[PDB]
């Protein structure tokens, strides 16, 4: 249909032979590399060498919260939104560099961030991180692909379109997003109350859930043996609930029960599968239409209030501006915004100034359970284990590694604490969730945890000679392995710890020194910029869902090699600063000091060392 | 600086400008017809910070510290108390514009005024001379903190569609706004930089939940304007090998929801301002003043 | 000279009566408020309501160290680069909001900074601070001048 209308317009506007101007390739799903290769060969056969590569194919994603996010969906959206970009760029670049010109443009969106300023976008972390990956890819390949090839990205804001279509930035049926928002809020409050109860109450998860079987909020409210968290939840459900809706009188339904059971199971908590089979079903309507209408208008009003000009641009305007931009020749590696003027909180990154944490937070480290994960960074992990055990009275530390060799090396480097029983080792491989599960089951639930990448940074070339076959250049499989090891691993660890009642989680980007090559620096910058958005999104999301966990990012990567140490003194200074930064981002905050403002500050922040 | 090693000509920029001007759904953005430049940046917006090192705190003992301001009576009171009573400062000088402000600050801390530790000078619009007398008859300063004199006006920024805009902020009032909120900081910074200061804390105007929308707009204007000046002067001082550390401490937040709502959070913000200015005013020992540490500690602006 | 070359190009490209399409108001120094008002009244008399205000006039500045910069140069730079923008915005806004359409475009510079990211530019603090002030003025007046008038 689209081809027919395009060729009809082309014939109308005076052009000749519209049949050779537009071709179609249906059945080309971007999620498969083979289909991408078929598209490349077919377009090469049809029109020869291709100059412009407009990569726009992108889906909304899993449309679920991080702690509600299956791993396979995360992988699928990563392939769809980020990996295929480099796949097509790798397939096409040699020809454009052969002809001496070329242009690739990624169709991003506003809702993922910018230079030194991240933008949270809750329930949609995968979309945001893939978006930041696209921007980072363009920004870092600008220098290498020059001067023959230009690279740029376009990040339009909310643009009016079909309510059933779009990548989730715009509604759309306010009713469905509204009901899912309320269901998610109910599940989040109930899960948070259960976790808070299990944190300090001696009753196991089974007995705590047993109080929820009658599905009677009143029975929970005046129950004297009920935890303060659940009684307060009952009081809040009475205060904010609607008597006309059974939810003000009933705790949950079948779908919420199943989702809660999934959360509990993935969190390392033991519960039978049939525990929610005998739950009473609340009579309809579980939610009244007044509430859904009210908060649907609330969401719509917020989205509209984001706009300075009180009106949303249309698709044609964005396309017109995009083609006008494509006429510019002297731009490469920038982000174009055809629409802007938006109200949203930002989380600036690139912070490098910091001191030492408060002594009260340091005292919290005593007697806690701390896990450290990594393969490559043996010296840093050794120093951190020494710092937690010997200097702040940590009880036990678990070193989680990918292979037996890493476990043996870490054991030998710290044999004195291994034989003392204060440094223990587990092997994770690609089932890191299982390693975390055994660690929790056989040693207890964690407190603060720091995660570092397993694999090093590859040194394969990113650009080849013009008259070459690009045999040794970074391949698509290599990029997939890169994103799996450096991005998927952090996501998996963060999800597992978040469902496992962590106190704080510090993500470590790959380290860079003056000894690293230019390609390593480019890949490290890509990873850091991509991970910034994920960290900001998860921090804001956890802050909003009333989670205790403080998730932060620490940067061992610096943008320029002139910023890296040149003497051993500066190297040990950076080591000590890394220790101080992790201390800042891992030291638990006392529950009395955990206010709204302080909790807002200490989540989603990234510090560059 | 260039990725492409080619500088586009004026005609290309004009072409891009004419093409971009036809867009009908953009306002308040920053459009760059060209880019791809390798230049060092100083990101702003820091908010997560703590207490400085005790060694830097010990440097504050026995130093000469000046405080300047008119509108922040409570803030200046709290900070003067913090430097004098808690960290062994010999004397503090309050540089003010009006006799009324000098009398007010004298009454708020009369106990220190009679003790000879809090002493007041009147500056008006010749603050350079006031600082000159202060240096001449007390000695040269150490760390100094400067705050704006005048408050934020509440004249309208835009009037109704069928209104004459007679009461809207005009050219003159904008001129005094720029003079008081921008030129004053420049003058104080230049005077201290040429007077061998130890550190310089520039204070942005304050806003609370009681502030009006126009006050928020002018506060954001002043913040964004002063960010560039502070960053440039800090980097320039770092390259010119000056001892002085010039930093910015920020009392404003971008939206109403970010500001506190209760007195508890208000005194929390007060003590947070105190710790932030302690961070940006604690002198670093000359032995620890390395290249990297000096690079970090100049040109940085943090938000309270 | 520029007007003559422009009208020659317009006559070449097929337009008619080029003399009524390109006027000049020279001798107007941006550093004087009275000259700004004179420019405004001249443009209003010549063509009536003005839709586009392209504020490009801007000088390099004092061209010195901050520690070698007289205050008078600081004031001159602020008046030429920052104050004049709001002056012309004030004088031209009433017509644009009366007719329901308008656009003002201010010529900033990359070396002045960005949101949440500053850029040092030595010897030239005045230029950078004024340029970032122009950017801030646009970004903050976008809300109040809308939806009738655009600012960028």
mmCIF file with all atom_site columns, C-alpha atoms in Angstrom, chain A residues 349-355 380 384 507-513 528 532 553-560 563-565 570-585 606-609, chain B residues 292-293 295-296 300:
data_model
loop_
_atom_site.group_PDB
_atom_site.id
_atom_site.type_symbol
_atom_site.label_atom_id
_atom_site.label_alt_id
_atom_site.label_comp_id
_atom_site.label_asym_id
_atom_site.label_entity_id
_atom_site.label_seq_id
_atom_site.pdbx_PDB_ins_code
_atom_site.Cartn_x
_atom_site.Cartn_y
_atom_site.Cartn_z
_atom_site.occupancy
_atom_site.B_iso_or_equiv
_atom_site.pdbx_formal_charge
_atom_site.auth_seq_id
_atom_site.auth_comp_id
_atom_site.auth_asym_id
_atom_site.auth_atom_id
_atom_site.pdbx_PDB_model_num
ATOM 1  C CA . UNK A 1 349 ? 26.555 12.421 34.560 1.00 0.00 ? 349 UNK A CA 1
ATOM 2  C CA . UNK A 1 350 ? 30.308 12.856 34.395 1.00 0.00 ? 350 UNK A CA 1
ATOM 3  C CA . UNK A 1 351 ? 30.744 13.733 38.061 1.00 0.00 ? 351 UNK A CA 1
ATOM 4  C CA . UNK A 1 352 ? 34.358 13.423 39.180 1.00 0.00 ? 352 UNK A CA 1
ATOM 5  C CA . UNK A 1 353 ? 34.440 15.364 42.488 1.00 0.00 ? 353 UNK A CA 1
ATOM 6  C CA . UNK A 1 354 ? 33.865 13.384 45.685 1.00 0.00 ? 354 UNK A CA 1
ATOM 7  C CA . UNK A 1 355 ? 35.243 12.811 49.163 1.00 0.00 ? 355 UNK A CA 1
ATOM 8  C CA . UNK A 1 380 ? 40.894 -4.118 42.022 1.00 0.00 ? 380 UNK A CA 1
ATOM 9  C CA . UNK A 1 384 ? 38.275 -4.016 47.546 1.00 0.00 ? 384 UNK A CA 1
ATOM 10 C CA . UNK A 1 507 ? 28.219 -1.085 38.602 1.00 0.00 ? 507 UNK A CA 1
ATOM 11 C CA . UNK A 1 508 ? 31.812 -0.843 37.325 1.00 0.00 ? 508 UNK A CA 1
ATOM 12 C CA . UNK A 1 509 ? 32.558 0.091  33.716 1.00 0.00 ? 509 UNK A CA 1
ATOM 13 C CA . UNK A 1 510 ? 35.666 -1.372 32.048 1.00 0.00 ? 510 UNK A CA 1
ATOM 14 C CA . UNK A 1 511 ? 38.948 0.224  33.061 1.00 0.00 ? 511 UNK A CA 1
ATOM 15 C CA . UNK A 1 512 ? 41.113 2.305  30.722 1.00 0.00 ? 512 UNK A CA 1
ATOM 16 C CA . UNK A 1 513 ? 44.758 3.356  31.015 1.00 0.00 ? 513 UNK A CA 1
ATOM 17 C CA . UNK A 1 528 ? 29.963 3.851  29.546 1.00 0.00 ? 528 UNK A CA 1
ATOM 18 C CA . UNK A 1 532 ? 24.644 5.646  31.995 1.00 0.00 ? 532 UNK A CA 1
ATOM 19 C CA . UNK A 1 553 ? 27.624 3.541  38.794 1.00 0.00 ? 553 UNK A CA 1
ATOM 20 C CA . UNK A 1 554 ? 31.373 4.112  39.166 1.00 0.00 ? 554 UNK A CA 1
ATOM 21 C CA . UNK A 1 555 ? 33.527 4.916  36.134 1.00 0.00 ? 555 UNK A CA 1
ATOM 22 C CA . UNK A 1 556 ? 37.058 3.616  35.638 1.00 0.00 ? 556 UNK A CA 1
ATOM 23 C CA . UNK A 1 557 ? 36.905 4.865  32.029 1.00 0.00 ? 557 UNK A CA 1
ATOM 24 C CA . UNK A 1 558 ? 38.080 8.301  30.916 1.00 0.00 ? 558 UNK A CA 1
ATOM 25 C CA . UNK A 1 559 ? 37.230 9.891  27.589 1.00 0.00 ? 559 UNK A CA 1
ATOM 26 C CA . UNK A 1 560 ? 40.801 10.774 26.592 1.00 0.00 ? 560 UNK A CA 1
ATOM 27 C CA . UNK A 1 563 ? 43.461 11.769 31.271 1.00 0.00 ? 563 UNK A CA 1
ATOM 28 C CA . UNK A 1 564 ? 45.030 8.434  32.271 1.00 0.00 ? 564 UNK A CA 1
ATOM 29 C CA . UNK A 1 565 ? 47.902 7.926  34.742 1.00 0.00 ? 565 UNK A CA 1
ATOM 30 C CA . UNK A 1 570 ? 48.813 8.315  39.934 1.00 0.00 ? 570 UNK A CA 1
ATOM 31 C CA . UNK A 1 571 ? 47.797 4.681  39.403 1.00 0.00 ? 571 UNK A CA 1
ATOM 32 C CA . UNK A 1 572 ? 47.630 3.994  43.143 1.00 0.00 ? 572 UNK A CA 1
ATOM 33 C CA . UNK A 1 573 ? 45.841 7.327  43.581 1.00 0.00 ? 573 UNK A CA 1
ATOM 34 C CA . UNK A 1 574 ? 43.171 6.180  41.115 1.00 0.00 ? 574 UNK A CA 1
ATOM 35 C CA . UNK A 1 575 ? 42.952 2.853  42.948 1.00 0.00 ? 575 UNK A CA 1
ATOM 36 C CA . UNK A 1 576 ? 42.346 4.662  46.244 1.00 0.00 ? 576 UNK A CA 1
ATOM 37 C CA . UNK A 1 577 ? 39.817 6.990  44.590 1.00 0.00 ? 577 UNK A CA 1
ATOM 38 C CA . UNK A 1 578 ? 37.985 3.961  43.187 1.00 0.00 ? 578 UNK A CA 1
ATOM 39 C CA . UNK A 1 579 ? 37.875 2.552  46.717 1.00 0.00 ? 579 UNK A CA 1
ATOM 40 C CA . UNK A 1 580 ? 36.478 5.850  48.025 1.00 0.00 ? 580 UNK A CA 1
ATOM 41 C CA . UNK A 1 581 ? 33.888 6.052  45.237 1.00 0.00 ? 581 UNK A CA 1
ATOM 42 C CA . UNK A 1 582 ? 32.643 2.490  45.840 1.00 0.00 ? 582 UNK A CA 1
ATOM 43 C CA . UNK A 1 583 ? 32.542 3.363  49.557 1.00 0.00 ? 583 UNK A CA 1
ATOM 44 C CA . UNK A 1 584 ? 30.297 6.325  48.727 1.00 0.00 ? 584 UNK A CA 1
ATOM 45 C CA . UNK A 1 585 ? 28.009 4.285  46.469 1.00 0.00 ? 585 UNK A CA 1
ATOM 46 C CA . UNK A 1 606 ? 27.399 8.018  38.318 1.00 0.00 ? 606 UNK A CA 1
ATOM 47 C CA . UNK A 1 607 ? 30.894 9.099  39.368 1.00 0.00 ? 607 UNK A CA 1
ATOM 48 C CA . UNK A 1 608 ? 33.927 9.165  37.073 1.00 0.00 ? 608 UNK A CA 1
ATOM 49 C CA . UNK A 1 609 ? 37.291 8.279  38.615 1.00 0.00 ? 609 UNK A CA 1
ATOM 50 C CA . UNK B 2 292 ? 44.960 16.133 38.674 1.00 0.00 ? 292 UNK B CA 1
ATOM 51 C CA . UNK B 2 293 ? 43.566 17.297 42.022 1.00 0.00 ? 293 UNK B CA 1
ATOM 52 C CA . UNK B 2 295 ? 42.103 20.085 37.711 1.00 0.00 ? 295 UNK B CA 1
ATOM 53 C CA . UNK B 2 296 ? 39.205 18.507 39.620 1.00 0.00 ? 296 UNK B CA 1
ATOM 54 C CA . UNK B 2 300 ? 33.100 22.867 39.487 1.00 0.00 ? 300 UNK B CA 1
#
